[PDB]
Ligand binder design. Structure first.
Ligand SMILES: O=C(O)c1ccc2cc(C(=O)O)ccc2c1
Ligand SMILES: O=C(O)c1ccc2cc(C(=O)O)ccc2c1
Ligand SMILES: O=C(O)c1ccc2cc(C(=O)O)ccc2c1
Ligand SMILES: O=C(O)c1ccc2cc(C(=O)O)ccc2c1
Lengths: 309, 309, 309, 309
C-alpha cells in the first residue's frame, strides 16, 4: 500500500506512546525497531489491537532487523544510551553512525526526526552519516519546550492552551532561549496582558524558569517525561506526512541565520511534503542573539566531545 | 439525555451546513426551526442519516413551533428578511423581538449566537428583548472576517492557514477594522515577513481590500457564501459547549472598552462554559481607534432606523 | 505536493457538501469542476476559508476546464441532466462519454466514483468510455441506502446508529433489495431483537418501505436530499485514499456473482489503496436472488434506452 | 466548569495511557490518583502539556487524596495488588472496600468502570461497597478481548479491523466464551467466508486460542499489555460521557440472563447517558450456555476466596 511507513528506531517508553498516537491518528504503518529481542514485537502486538477502538487500519510490527528500514517514509530516532553525561557522547555518535549507514542504504529518501540527547548535536551527526538532504532531517526541541511555556501561560490567563504561541530557540536543553518578545495570546502581544495586570513580569520569570526545568521537575516527582515528547514528535511527523505546512520550531541546519553556519540549531521552520520547506529566521535583537550564541557554543562543545574516545 | 440541545432558529442554507457540521462533530442534538412548513423536517431527515457515516449519535429534528426552544443550551439565530437594505431594519427588529420573547419564556439560560444582518445591531436588539445576561449572547463577525484574511495570507506565504492569526474588530460589514499591526505568522509579527520581502505592503493592501469585499466577490461569482459563516459559528458554539476557552473575535456588549458603552462591537473574547468569560480590549492607537469609532457609528445609525416604521 | 487531488465533476448542491467534508477531514486538494461559468470558483472560494476553522490545509479551486482532470487521484461524477425520466438517459450517456474521454486522456490512473442517476447504468457507461480497470470505478448506492435503514432501526432500538449494520443490494433506486436476513445490531442478528419483542416484523416492514422511499419523502417535505449522499461518497473516497479497506456496498462490475455478468450492480466490496480490492458475494437464497434479478433487469432496461436518441 | 471530571483511581502504566487518550479526545478533566507519593503529579504534568499539540483544554492533575473523588462523573479503578494469584483476592477485596467507601461518600452519582483483576469479581465487590445503582457500574472485558479477535480476523481477511464484529462473554480471563456463531465481517456471517475458503475453521481455532492467550503472549515477548486495555476503557467511558449508546461487551450485574443472578458477567450492554441503558442477552444454545456457566463458576469460586484471610 501507499500508506506511509513510519519506522521508530528505538522502542522504549517514548516509542510506545508514538505508536499509540500514530494509530489514533491513522497516520501510517508503524515499525517498532529496537536492538532488544522480543520486546518491540510485544509492544507492537498490544498497540495493533487499538485499531479496532480507533476505527483505524495501521499495521504495527516489531523489528530487530535494520534492513526493515527499507521503504521508510519517516524515521524517528530515539535509540541511544542515557545512563558525566558527556561520557555518553562518543557512544551515541557510534549509534548515529550505524543508524545513518542503514538509512543511506535502505531509505535515503526518508524524512528523519532525531530525538537522541543531546538532540542538536545528534541530529547533525546523523545528517552527516546518513547523507540525506538538509531539508529531510530535523531534531526535536522547540515544539516540546514551547508546549510547556504555552501551557503554563494558558492556565494563568484561563485561555485555550493552543491560543498561546511562543518561541524558544537555539537549542533544546538548559541553554534554550526563551523569547519574551515573541509570546502572544490569541495573536495579541503578551505585553498587553502584562500592561493590564492579567499577568506580571515576575510570574513570567517564574514560568520561564519552570519551562527550562520541566523535565527535571517531572523526574523529581518520580515520573518519566516521555508523553509530551511523543506528542510533539507526532505533530512534526504529521505536518510532513499530510503536507500541513505548519510553523514548528525544530533543530535544522543553519546556513548563516543568526550569524551561524555549519551547525544545527532550534528555529521556526515550515514542515510539509518537501520536508523543511522554509527556515524562518527571527529578527532577534543583540541581547537575544547573545543567548542564541551561548546555545550554539554548548552544542559545538558537545559535538567536539562526540567524535573520539 | 444531557447531550446539549442546539436550536437553529432559521433553517436556510447556512442552517443545513451548521446541522451537518454539528453531526460531524457529534456536538449535540439539533433542532432545525423555521417558519416555512415541512422544509426543516426534510433537511433534518437528510442530515440525520449522516450519523451513520460520522459514527455520531445526534438527533436532528425539524420544527415549526417556537416552544421547541425549551431546554435549548445553544440558540443560533439566522432568521430574518434579506431581500434600501436599511428598509429591512424595522422588519428584522420585529423578528428579533418575537424570537427574544420566546427565548425569555422557554430557554432563558441558553447561550445565544446571532447572525442576522446587520449582526452588530441585531445581536443587541435580541439581547434587550431576550433578557439574557451580557455574557450569554454574542454576534458572528471576526471569526468569519479573519478566516478570509488568515487564509489569503497563508496562501501567499505557503504556511498552514491556522498558523496565520489576525484581528478584525469594530463591526462585521464594510466598516470592519483590519488591524495590520496584529497579524502574525506562526506567532511571529507579520512585519518580519514584510522586512524579508516574503510579502509586500502592497500585496497586503490588496488582501485587506479582498477581505472586506469577499462576500460580494463570491456573490459576483454566482455563488452564495454561507459555508464559511456556518463553520465560524460552529467554532464559536463548540468553544462554549466544550469549555475550550478559545480566543475568538465576536460581537459583544461594550462597557467602556475602546471608549464605547451601550453598544455591541467586534472584539476578541474568550468563550467557555460561562459564555463570554473575558472581553479582551486591544490596546489600539489613535488611528486604529478612529476606524473603530466609524464602525460603531454605523452600527448606531442602523440601530436607530430599526425601531420604527 | 503528494496530497491527493480530488476532482468533483459537477459542482451542484452535493458538490459543495462534498468539498466541505473533504476540508473538514483534510483529505486532499479539491477541484470543483462544472460547465457553469464562475459558480464553481465562488463555491471554492467560500469553502477554502474553512481551512482556518478546521485546522486543515486543502486547496479548493474552481474549474471550467476539463484538462484540470490531469493528475486527479479521485474523480467524483455528479454531472448530468435531472429535469419521462427515461428521456434523459441518452443525454446523460453523452455526458458520460465526454467525461470518460477526458478521464482516459488526463487521469487514466484515477479512482472514479459515479453518482449520476441512474447510477448503476451510468457507472458502466463511464467505465466503458474511460477505459479504467474494473477495480478503479464504482457507483454510489448501498452506503447511502443502508444509512437510512441503519439509522431508522437505531432510533427504534435506542442504539448508536453505526452499531446497526445492514445490506441493500442489486441497484440504487426503487428496485433496491433490502435483505432482512443480513441486519445486525451490535453484531447480533436482528432476529434476536424481534424474538424479544424489542422490534416487530411489522415495524421492520414499515422501515423497509420508508428506506426505499426516503429520497421521495424528503422531496415531499420541500427539501433536497443531497447531504447524506455527499457523506456516503466521502466515506467511500476516504476508504480508498487512506487504505482503510472498509466493507462498503457499492455498484461494481459483476463477473458471475449472483449469476450475473457484464453489468454493474450493488454489492459489498472492500475499498482500499488498490481500489475495489475484493468483491463480496452474499450467499443469497432463491427468494433474495429473484429480487436481485429484478434489480439487474431494470438496470439493463435503462442501459438499452441510453445508447440512442 | 461543566466539563466532565474523570478520576483514575490508580495511576500506573494503564493510567498514563488513559490520561493521554482523554486529552487527545478532549473528553474531560483528569485526576490521576494513586497512593504513591509525587508520581501521579509528575505524570499529570507531562500529560497536561499535550493539550497544546491536541488543541484540547483538559486539566490533568495528580492526587494522593481520596476526597478528590468529589464531583467525579466517571471513576476508573485500576488500583490493586498484582504480585497463588488467588492469595491476592482478600487483599484486593480490602482495596475495593476502601475505594467503595470513598465513592459512596464523595461521588455516589458517578459512573464506575472497574479493571482490577479478576475484574468480574472485583466489579461486584465494588458495587456492593460503593452502593451505586446497578446501571452505574461495569467491568472491563469484552471490548478488550474482542478487539483481539476482531483484529486477528481482519488481518487474515484484509479488511478494516472495525468491520469485524464478535462476541466474547461470561468473563474476562481464561474462561472467556468465544462465540464463533456471532462473528461477522462487514455485517455478513463469518460462515460465508469459511464456505468460500477465505478463512478456514482450523485458522479460526488458532485465532481463538491466540485471543484467549494474548496477554500472556505479550508478556512472554517481554512487554506489558496495557495499551489496548486503556483504549477499550476509554471507548466505554466515552460512550457514557457523549451518550453514544454503543453496544459494548462489559461486565454487568446479571438478574436472570443466561439463567444467572446475583453475579456479574460479560455481556453486550448499551452505554449512554444513563449508564447501562440496556443489558442484551444473547440467545445462546445449550453448548454455548455450558461454557458461560463455567465462566460464572470460576468468578464465584474467586469471589468466595476474596472475603476472608
Ligand atoms: O523513552 C523514554 O524513556 C524517554 C524519556 C524522556 C524523554 C525526554 C525527551 C526530551 O525531553 O527531549 C525526549 C525523549 C524521551 C524519551
Ligand atoms: O443561509 C444563507 O443563505 C446565508 C448566505 C450568506 C450568509 C452570509 C453571512 C455573512 O457573511 O455574515 C452570514 C449568514 C449567511 C447565510
Ligand atoms: O446535488 C444535488 O442537488 C443532489 C440532490 C439529490 C441527490 C440524490 C442522490 C441520491 O439519492 O442518489 C445523489 C445525488 C444527489 C445530488
Ligand atoms: O497498568 C498496567 O501495568 C497494566 C498492565 C496490564 C493490564 C492488563 C489488563 C487486562 O488484560 O485486563 C488490564 C489492565 C492492565 C494494566
Amino acid at each position: 500500500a501507499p500508506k506511509a511507513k513510519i519506522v521508530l528506531v528505538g522502542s522504549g517508553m517514548i516509542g510506545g506512546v508514538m505508536a499509540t498516537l500514530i494509530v489514533q491518528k491513522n497516520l501510517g504503518d508503524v515499525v517498532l525497531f529496537d536492538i532488544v529481542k522480543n520486546m518491540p514485537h510485544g509492544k507492537a502486538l498490544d498497540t495493533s489491537h487499538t485499531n479496532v477502538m480507533a476505527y483505524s487500519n495501521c499495521k504495527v510490527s516489531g523489528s530487530n532487523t535494520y534492513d526493515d528500514l527499507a521503504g521508510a517514509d519517516v524515521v524517528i530516532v530515539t535509540a541511544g544510551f542515557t545512563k558525566n553525561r558527556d561520557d555518553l557522547l562518543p557512544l551515541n555518535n557510534k549509534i548515529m553512525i550505524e543508524i545513518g549507514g542503514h538509512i543511506k542504504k535502505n531509505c535515503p529518501n526518508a524524512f528523519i526526526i532525531v530525538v537522541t540527547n543531546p538532540v542538536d548535536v545528534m541530529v547533525q551527526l546523523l545528517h552527516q552519516h546518513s547523507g540525506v538532504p538538509k531539508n529531510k532531517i530535523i531534531g526535536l526541541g522547540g515544539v516540546l519546550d514551547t508546549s510547556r511555556l504555552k501551557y503554563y501561560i494558558s492556565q494563568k490567563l484561563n485561555v485555550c492552551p493552543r491560543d498561546v504561541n511562543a518561541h524558544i530557540v537555539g537549542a533544546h536543553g538548559n541553554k534554550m532561549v526563551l523569547l519574551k518578545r515573541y509570546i502572544t495570546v490569541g495573536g495579541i502581544p503578551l505585553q498587553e496582558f502584562i500592561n493590564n495586570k492579567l499577568i506580571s513580569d515576575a510570574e513570567l520569570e517564574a514560568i520561564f524558569d519552570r519551562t527550562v526545568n520541566t523535565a527535571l521537575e517531572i523526574v523529581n516527582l518520580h515520573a518519566s517525561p516521555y508523553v509530551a515528547p511523543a506528542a510533539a514528535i507526532i505533530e512534526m511527523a504529521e505536518s510532513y506526512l499530510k503536507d500541513l505546512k505548519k510553523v514548528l520550531i525544530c533543530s535544522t541546519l543553519l546556513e548563516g541565520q543568526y550569524g551561524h553556519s555549519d551547525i544545527f540549531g532550534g528555529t521556526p521552520v515550515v514542515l510539509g511534503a518537501n520536508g523543511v520547506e522554509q527556515v524562518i529566521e527571527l529578527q532577534l535583537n543583540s541581547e537575544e542573539k547573545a543567548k542564541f550564541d551561548e546555545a550554539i557554543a554548548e552544542t559545538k562543545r558537545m559535538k567536539a566531545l562526540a567524535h573520539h574516545h
